Scaffold this active site. Structure first.
Site, mmCIF file in Angstrom:
data_model
loop_
_atom_site.group_PDB
_atom_site.id
_atom_site.type_symbol
_atom_site.label_atom_id
_atom_site.label_comp_id
_atom_site.label_asym_id
_atom_site.label_seq_id
_atom_site.Cartn_x
_atom_site.Cartn_y
_atom_site.Cartn_z
ATOM 1 N N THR A 196 0.901 -1.228 -0.055
ATOM 2 C CA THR A 196 -0.045 -0.070 0.112
ATOM 3 C C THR A 196 0.871 1.338 0.008
ATOM 4 O O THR A 196 0.693 2.411 -0.752
ATOM 5 C CB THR A 196 -1.008 0.161 1.404
ATOM 6 O OG1 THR A 196 -1.639 -1.119 1.132
ATOM 7 C CG2 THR A 196 -1.861 1.198 1.212
ATOM 8 N N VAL A 203 7.359 -0.329 -1.643
ATOM 9 C CA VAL A 203 8.149 -1.429 -2.091
ATOM 10 C C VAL A 203 8.592 -2.498 -1.164
ATOM 11 O O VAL A 203 9.036 -1.963 -0.071
ATOM 12 C CB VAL A 203 9.112 -1.163 -3.213
ATOM 13 C CG1 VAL A 203 10.406 -0.393 -2.727
ATOM 14 C CG2 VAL A 203 9.452 -2.454 -4.164
ATOM 15 N N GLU A 207 10.570 -9.967 9.497
ATOM 16 C CA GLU A 207 10.823 -11.400 9.152
ATOM 17 C C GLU A 207 10.303 -11.826 7.982
ATOM 18 O O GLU A 207 9.319 -11.459 7.249
ATOM 19 C CB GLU A 207 10.246 -12.335 10.313
ATOM 20 C CG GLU A 207 8.909 -12.531 9.984
ATOM 21 C CD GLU A 207 8.299 -13.784 11.106
ATOM 22 O OE1 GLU A 207 7.392 -13.296 11.852
ATOM 23 O OE2 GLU A 207 8.507 -14.842 10.786
ATOM 24 N N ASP A 248 -7.372 -3.515 7.335
ATOM 25 C CA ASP A 248 -7.367 -3.760 5.798
ATOM 26 C C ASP A 248 -6.760 -5.211 5.553
ATOM 27 O O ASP A 248 -5.921 -5.695 4.825
ATOM 28 C CB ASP A 248 -6.255 -2.707 5.183
ATOM 29 C CG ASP A 248 -6.266 -2.849 3.800
ATOM 30 O OD1 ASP A 248 -7.607 -3.220 2.880
ATOM 31 O OD2 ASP A 248 -5.490 -2.521 2.748
ATOM 32 N N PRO A 276 -6.212 -11.372 1.775
ATOM 33 C CA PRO A 276 -5.270 -12.677 1.596
ATOM 34 C C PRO A 276 -3.584 -12.266 1.333
ATOM 35 O O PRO A 276 -2.744 -13.049 1.821
ATOM 36 C CB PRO A 276 -5.783 -13.210 0.248
ATOM 37 C CG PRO A 276 -7.288 -12.963 0.273
ATOM 38 C CD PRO A 276 -7.319 -11.598 0.727
ATOM 39 N N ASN A 324 -2.105 -9.896 3.069
ATOM 40 C CA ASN A 324 -1.441 -9.815 4.195
ATOM 41 C C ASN A 324 -1.552 -10.892 5.049
ATOM 42 O O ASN A 324 -1.109 -10.772 6.259
ATOM 43 C CB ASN A 324 -2.389 -8.575 4.876
ATOM 44 C CG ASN A 324 -1.961 -7.057 4.259
ATOM 45 O OD1 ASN A 324 -0.815 -6.814 4.004
ATOM 46 N ND2 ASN A 324 -2.798 -6.178 4.288
HETATM 47 O O1 LIG Z 1 2.986 -13.647 -6.877
HETATM 48 C C1 LIG Z 1 3.441 -14.704 -6.119
HETATM 49 C C2 LIG Z 1 4.751 -14.151 -5.296
HETATM 50 C C3 LIG Z 1 5.823 -13.796 -5.817
HETATM 51 C C4 LIG Z 1 6.504 -13.564 -4.798
HETATM 52 N N1 LIG Z 1 6.167 -13.671 -3.662
HETATM 53 C C5 LIG Z 1 6.480 -13.763 -2.472
HETATM 54 C C6 LIG Z 1 7.644 -13.724 -1.849
HETATM 55 C C7 LIG Z 1 8.087 -13.577 -0.559
HETATM 56 C C8 LIG Z 1 6.911 -13.351 0.502
HETATM 57 N N2 LIG Z 1 7.515 -13.058 1.667
HETATM 58 C C9 LIG Z 1 7.301 -12.031 2.468
HETATM 59 C C10 LIG Z 1 6.533 -10.921 2.048
HETATM 60 C C11 LIG Z 1 6.602 -9.893 3.114
HETATM 61 N N3 LIG Z 1 5.645 -8.848 2.813
HETATM 62 C C12 LIG Z 1 5.319 -7.931 3.476
HETATM 63 O O2 LIG Z 1 4.774 -6.792 3.188
HETATM 64 C C13 LIG Z 1 3.761 -6.893 2.248
HETATM 65 C C14 LIG Z 1 2.506 -7.967 2.894
HETATM 66 C C15 LIG Z 1 1.238 -7.601 1.851
HETATM 67 N N4 LIG Z 1 0.647 -6.107 1.963
HETATM 68 C C16 LIG Z 1 1.922 -5.273 1.469
HETATM 69 C C17 LIG Z 1 3.133 -5.342 2.092
HETATM 70 C C18 LIG Z 1 5.735 -8.022 4.644
HETATM 71 C C19 LIG Z 1 6.396 -9.164 5.236
HETATM 72 C C20 LIG Z 1 6.932 -10.049 4.169
HETATM 73 C C21 LIG Z 1 7.322 -11.342 4.750
HETATM 74 N N5 LIG Z 1 7.698 -12.288 3.694
HETATM 75 C C22 LIG Z 1 5.819 -13.262 0.031
HETATM 76 F F1 LIG Z 1 4.725 -13.291 0.846
HETATM 77 C C23 LIG Z 1 5.567 -13.634 -1.148
HETATM 78 N N6 LIG Z 1 4.642 -14.340 -4.242
#
Ligand SMILES: OCc1ccn(-c2ccc(Nc3cc4nc(OC5CCNCC5)ccc4cn3)c(F)c2)n1
EC number: 2.7.11.22
Length: 291
Positions: A16, A19, A76, A122, A125, A127
């Protein structure tokens, strides 16, 4: 500066506010998810407090770095989000024991944060983040109180309305913890049916989708609803549908729980604490998912 300690590995995604990158901390060796927000004194205080809001079902906020007109949130690292898992499980469905494990865990996360009077506001899925062990964790908890929930993200992407509680849509300025129970109920229904419950594409489309399934709310089910800021007496009066139609083939314990999570009146909507005691969770286990 401060960011010479982090080596960028790959881009995860776009939130939101900013990056998100996978990164390596050079001093500790830790692998992290690094959120970079382009920049407010009140926001810095409120976000810094989230370092103390620690629970096994909340994505760990490791650090908060304010430097060079930017705010970095160090989280994390987890394997993937629930959106990807649901898309990958489209043909077969997520098994009921795993749906139940995930809902149980998410309710524990909500019960913790709600006990400290912190809302998410907010939930969706994207999140909800999973590992290969069977854990699920809530990401972005508390950021909405710091920054607000905008209409569009920092990349101009539409912020989804699908999980938004009806009190927010009807213009209530003062959100209770019930807004998160609503969102989680919508997510529960989506895991079960493999389709979004209320996929609205505008505020009125979102409201009318809710009304077409649950009935147009009135003073009987929701005292004060007809006085809310964006309530109009001209709303069409749709009848309520049976939950047997909405979330088949979910059992009566599941339907009972879901119905209580989707009560119109926030004061009547089940709390996270009360939801954990619901009979639906009597046979809960922790399965290992197919990722
Ligand atoms: O298209 C399929 C795909 C492509 C890449 N991935 C993917 C690679 C790694 C992770 N790990 C992850 C992500 C995080 N993201 C955060 O912040 C966002 C959460 C949603 N709202 C905006 C802020 C915070 C902490 C996080 C910790 N680990 C993952 F979730 C997806 N999946």
């Amino acid at each position: 500066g401060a960011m010479e300690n982090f080596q960028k590995v790959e881009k995860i995604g776009e939130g939101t506010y900013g990056v998100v990158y996978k990164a390596r901390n050079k001093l500790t060796g830790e692998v992290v998810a690094l959120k970079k927000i382009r920049l407010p004194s009140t926001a810095i205080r409120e976000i810094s407090l989230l370092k103390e809001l620690n629970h096994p079902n909340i994505v760990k906020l490791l650090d908060v770095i304010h430097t060079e007109n930017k705010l970095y949130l160090v989280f994390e690292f987890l394997h993937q989000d629930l959106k990807k898992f649901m898309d990958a499980s489209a043909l077969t469905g997520i098994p009921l024991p795993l749906i139940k494990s995930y809902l149980f865990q998410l309710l524990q996360g909500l019960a913790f944060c709600h006990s400290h009077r912190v809302l998410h506001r907010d939930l969706k899925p994207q999140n909800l983040l999973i590992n290969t062990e069977g854990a699920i964790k809530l990401a972005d908890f508390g950021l909405a109180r710091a920054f607000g929930v905008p209409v569009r993200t920092y990349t101009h992407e539409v912020v989804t309305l699908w999980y938004r509680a009806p009190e927010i849509l009807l213009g209530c300025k003062y959100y209770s913890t019930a807004v998160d129970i609503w969102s989680l109920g919508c997510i529960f229904a989506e895991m079960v049916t493999r389709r979004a419950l209320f996929p609205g594409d505008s505020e009125i489309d979102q409201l009318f989708r809710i009304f077409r399934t649950l009935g147009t709310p009135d003073e009987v089910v929701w005292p004060g609803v007809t006085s809310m800021p964006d309530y109009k007496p001209s709303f069409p009066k749709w009848a309520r549908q049976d939950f047997s139609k909405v979330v088949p083939p979910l059992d009566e314990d599941g339907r009972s729980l879901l119905s209580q999570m989707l009560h119109y009146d926030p004061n009547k909507r089940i709390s996270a604490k009360a939801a954990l005691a619901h009979p639906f969770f009597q046979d809960v286990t922790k399965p290992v998912p197919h990722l």
